[PDB]
Design a protein around this motif. Structure first.
Motif, PDB file in Angstrom:
ATOM      1  N   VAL A  53       0.870  -1.177   0.000  1.00 14.98           N
ATOM      2  CA  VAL A  53       0.000   0.000   0.000  1.00 14.98           C
ATOM      3  C   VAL A  53       0.907   1.227   0.000  1.00 14.98           C
ATOM      4  CG1 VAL A  53      -1.674   1.404   1.292  1.00 14.98           C
ATOM      5  CG2 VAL A  53      -1.958  -1.130   1.130  1.00 14.98           C
ATOM      6  N   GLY A  54       0.700   2.138  -0.961  1.00 15.98           N
ATOM      7  CA  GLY A  54       1.422   3.406  -0.950  1.00 15.98           C
ATOM      8  C   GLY A  54       0.638   4.440  -0.150  1.00 15.98           C
ATOM      9  N   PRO A  63       3.347  15.745  11.583  1.00 17.62           N
ATOM     10  CA  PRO A  63       4.595  15.481  10.838  1.00 17.62           C
ATOM     11  C   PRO A  63       4.979  13.999  10.872  1.00 17.62           C
ATOM     12  CG  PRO A  63       4.804  17.438  12.266  1.00 17.62           C
ATOM     13  CD  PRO A  63       3.510  16.767  12.633  1.00 17.62           C
ATOM     14  N   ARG A  64       5.575  13.526   9.770  1.00 20.34           N
ATOM     15  CA  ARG A  64       6.156  12.201   9.577  1.00 20.34           C
ATOM     16  C   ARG A  64       7.595  12.379   9.104  1.00 20.34           C
ATOM     17  NH1 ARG A  64       0.976  11.589   9.942  1.00 20.34           N
ATOM     18  NH2 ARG A  64      -0.001   9.515   9.987  1.00 20.34           N
ATOM     19  N   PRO A  65       8.430  11.327   9.181  1.00 19.28           N
ATOM     20  CA  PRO A  65       9.812  11.445   8.693  1.00 19.28           C
ATOM     21  C   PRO A  65       9.904  11.842   7.237  1.00 19.28           C
ATOM     22  CG  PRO A  65       9.697   9.626  10.169  1.00 19.28           C
ATOM     23  CD  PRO A  65       8.267  10.115   9.983  1.00 19.28           C
ATOM     24  N   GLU A  66       8.953  11.419   6.399  1.00 26.82           N
ATOM     25  CA  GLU A  66       8.959  11.708   4.974  1.00 26.82           C
ATOM     26  C   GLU A  66       7.526  11.860   4.489  1.00 26.82           C
ATOM     27  OE1 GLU A  66      11.768  12.400   3.545  1.00 26.82           O
ATOM     28  OE2 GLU A  66      13.181  11.356   4.859  1.00 26.82           O
ATOM     29  N   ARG A  67       7.401  12.392   3.268  1.00 27.02           N
ATOM     30  CA  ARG A  67       6.084  12.629   2.698  1.00 27.02           C
ATOM     31  C   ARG A  67       5.389  11.306   2.392  1.00 27.02           C
ATOM     32  NH1 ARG A  67       4.167  15.634  -3.044  1.00 27.02           N
ATOM     33  NH2 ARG A  67       2.051  14.717  -2.972  1.00 27.02           N
ATOM     34  N   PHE A  68       6.144  10.314   1.949  1.00 22.40           N
ATOM     35  CA  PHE A  68       5.568   9.079   1.437  1.00 22.40           C
ATOM     36  C   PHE A  68       5.962   7.918   2.323  1.00 22.40           C
ATOM     37  CE2 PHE A  68       6.124  11.601  -2.586  1.00 22.40           C
ATOM     38  CZ  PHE A  68       4.804  11.651  -3.000  1.00 22.40           C
ATOM     39  N   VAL A  94       9.622   7.057   2.482  1.00 20.00           N
ATOM     40  CA  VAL A  94      10.227   7.287   1.176  1.00 20.00           C
ATOM     41  C   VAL A  94      10.297   8.797   0.938  1.00 20.00           C
ATOM     42  CG1 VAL A  94       9.833   7.055  -1.277  1.00 20.00           C
ATOM     43  CG2 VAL A  94       9.466   5.083   0.220  1.00 20.00           C
ATOM     44  N   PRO A  95      11.483   9.389   0.739  1.00 17.62           N
ATOM     45  CA  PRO A  95      11.573  10.847   0.598  1.00 17.62           C
ATOM     46  C   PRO A  95      10.959  11.368  -0.689  1.00 17.62           C
ATOM     47  CG  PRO A  95      13.717   9.880   0.265  1.00 17.62           C
ATOM     48  CD  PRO A  95      12.806   8.727   0.662  1.00 17.62           C
ATOM     49  N   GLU A  96      10.284  12.521  -0.584  1.00 16.04           N
ATOM     50  CA  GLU A  96       9.706  13.128  -1.773  1.00 16.04           C
ATOM     51  C   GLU A  96      10.799  13.467  -2.788  1.00 16.04           C
ATOM     52  OE1 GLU A  96       9.395  17.398   0.564  1.00 16.04           O
ATOM     53  OE2 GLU A  96       7.790  16.803  -0.840  1.00 16.04           O
ATOM     54  N   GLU A  97      12.029  13.674  -2.306  1.00 16.42           N
ATOM     55  CA  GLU A  97      13.151  14.047  -3.175  1.00 16.42           C
ATOM     56  C   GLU A  97      13.612  12.882  -4.027  1.00 16.42           C
ATOM     57  OE1 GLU A  97      12.932  14.738   0.130  1.00 16.42           O
ATOM     58  OE2 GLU A  97      12.688  16.932  -0.099  1.00 16.42           O
ATOM     59  N   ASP A  98      13.253  11.664  -3.629  1.00 22.33           N
ATOM     60  CA  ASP A  98      13.820  10.449  -4.213  1.00 22.33           C
ATOM     61  C   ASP A  98      12.829   9.325  -3.957  1.00 22.33           C
ATOM     62  OD1 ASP A  98      15.635   8.603  -5.328  1.00 22.33           O
ATOM     63  OD2 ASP A  98      16.337   8.066  -3.321  1.00 22.33           O
ATOM     64  N   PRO A  99      11.685   9.329  -4.629  1.00 21.21           N
ATOM     65  CA  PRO A  99      10.614   8.370  -4.307  1.00 21.21           C
ATOM     66  C   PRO A  99      10.881   7.023  -4.963  1.00 21.21           C
ATOM     67  CG  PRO A  99       9.879   9.954  -5.930  1.00 21.21           C
ATOM     68  CD  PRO A  99      11.232  10.390  -5.555  1.00 21.21           C
ATOM     69  N   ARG A 100      11.609   6.189  -4.238  1.00 20.77           N
ATOM     70  CA  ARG A 100      12.336   5.049  -4.787  1.00 20.77           C
ATOM     71  C   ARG A 100      12.590   4.043  -3.670  1.00 20.77           C
ATOM     72  NH1 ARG A 100      17.849   4.226  -5.772  1.00 20.77           N
ATOM     73  NH2 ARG A 100      18.046   6.039  -4.384  1.00 20.77           N
ATOM     74  N   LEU A 101      12.414   2.756  -3.980  1.00 21.14           N
ATOM     75  CA  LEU A 101      12.704   1.642  -3.089  1.00 21.14           C
ATOM     76  C   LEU A 101      13.273   0.506  -3.931  1.00 21.14           C
ATOM     77  CD1 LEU A 101       9.491   1.398  -0.929  1.00 21.14           C
ATOM     78  CD2 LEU A 101      11.791   1.880  -0.078  1.00 21.14           C
ATOM     79  N   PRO A 102      14.023  -0.404  -3.312  1.00 16.72           N
ATOM     80  CA  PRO A 102      14.420  -1.648  -4.000  1.00 16.72           C
ATOM     81  C   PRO A 102      13.198  -2.508  -4.276  1.00 16.72           C
ATOM     82  CG  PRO A 102      15.600  -1.400  -1.915  1.00 16.72           C
ATOM     83  CD  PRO A 102      14.589  -0.294  -1.965  1.00 16.72           C
ATOM     84  N   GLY A 123       3.890   7.118  -8.344  1.00 11.97           N
ATOM     85  CA  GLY A 123       5.156   7.405  -8.988  1.00 11.97           C
ATOM     86  C   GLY A 123       6.370   6.954  -8.208  1.00 11.97           C
ATOM     87  N   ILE A 124       6.189   6.089  -7.212  1.00 12.14           N
ATOM     88  CA  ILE A 124       7.326   5.570  -6.463  1.00 12.14           C
ATOM     89  C   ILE A 124       7.946   4.455  -7.296  1.00 12.14           C
ATOM     90  CG2 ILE A 124       7.983   4.221  -4.445  1.00 12.14           C
ATOM     91  CD1 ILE A 124       5.535   5.767  -3.057  1.00 12.14           C
ATOM     92  N   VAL A 125       9.236   4.581  -7.588  1.00 15.07           N
ATOM     93  CA  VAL A 125       9.944   3.636  -8.454  1.00 15.07           C
ATOM     94  C   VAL A 125      10.467   2.462  -7.636  1.00 15.07           C
ATOM     95  CG1 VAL A 125      11.931   3.350  -9.889  1.00 15.07           C
ATOM     96  CG2 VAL A 125      10.503   5.396 -10.148  1.00 15.07           C
ATOM     97  N   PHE A 126      10.144   1.238  -8.063  1.00 17.96           N
ATOM     98  CA  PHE A 126      10.682   0.046  -7.421  1.00 17.96           C
ATOM     99  C   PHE A 126      11.831  -0.417  -8.277  1.00 17.96           C
ATOM    100  CE2 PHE A 126       7.749  -0.307  -4.069  1.00 17.96           C
ATOM    101  CZ  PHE A 126       6.664   0.477  -4.526  1.00 17.96           C
ATOM    102  N   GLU A 127      13.032   0.001  -7.875  1.00 20.49           N
ATOM    103  CA  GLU A 127      14.206  -0.157  -8.717  1.00 20.49           C
ATOM    104  C   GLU A 127      14.569  -1.632  -8.828  1.00 20.49           C
ATOM    105  OE1 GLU A 127      17.216   2.881  -8.322  1.00 20.49           O
ATOM    106  OE2 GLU A 127      18.599   1.524  -9.394  1.00 20.49           O
ATOM    107  N   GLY A 128      14.721  -2.098 -10.069  1.00 18.25           N
ATOM    108  CA  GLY A 128      14.937  -3.504 -10.324  1.00 18.25           C
ATOM    109  C   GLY A 128      13.697  -4.275 -10.751  1.00 18.25           C
TER     110      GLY A 128
END
Ligand SMILES: [Ca+2]
Ligand SMILES: [Ca+2]
Ligand SMILES: [Ca+2]
Length: 134
Positions: A53-54, A63-68, A94-102, A123-128
């Motif tokens: 779930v995103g 406040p949370r540590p990150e936007r996502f 997941v940081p708004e600056e770099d919305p990306r996870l393995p 738009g969160i990229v699941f790299e790989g």
């Protein structure tokens, strides 16, 4: 029971633990430790990734540590015959600056669809991920 071990490790490593009183448990993993720990959960017998779930915390008041964040639902399925029904959620910010996870499509086949749904929605990229290379 696998869930005891999951929580023991989180406590020892200082990963935040959350409960809702209805039997639902969350472990918050740092993005830098996420893939290693997911692989460890798979090795421990969490054989079924039920859901991803995103989350977008934009406009919510606390406040949370990150936007996502992305939440994973892991299950040890009671059957053949180890497997004990343990179930818990992993949350990773997941940081708004770099919305990306393995990707974890190398650990659970259900991740192919579940990750793609989150990519399409947030738009969160699941790299790989086989569909999201480059
Ligand atoms: Ca469920
Ligand atoms: Ca679910
Ligand atoms: Ca769902």
């Amino acid at each position: 029971m696998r869930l005891e071990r999951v929580l023991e490790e989180a406590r020892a490593k200082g990963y935040p633990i959350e409960d809702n009183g209805l039997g639902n448990l969350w472990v918050v993993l740092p993005r830098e430790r996420f893939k290693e720990e997911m692989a460890h959960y798979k090795a421990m017998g969490f054989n079924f990734l039920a859901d991803i779930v995103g989350l977008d915390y934009l406009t919510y008041p606390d406040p949370r540590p990150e936007r996502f964040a992305v939440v994973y639902e892991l299950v040890s399925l009671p059957g053949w015959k180890d497997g004990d029904g343990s179930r818990f959620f992993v949350r990773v910010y997941v940081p708004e600056e770099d919305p990306r996870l393995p990707t974890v499509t190398d650990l659970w086949g259900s991740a192919n669809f579940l990750e793609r749904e989150v990519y399409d929605l947030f738009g969160i990229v699941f790299e790989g991920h086989p569909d999201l290379r480059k």
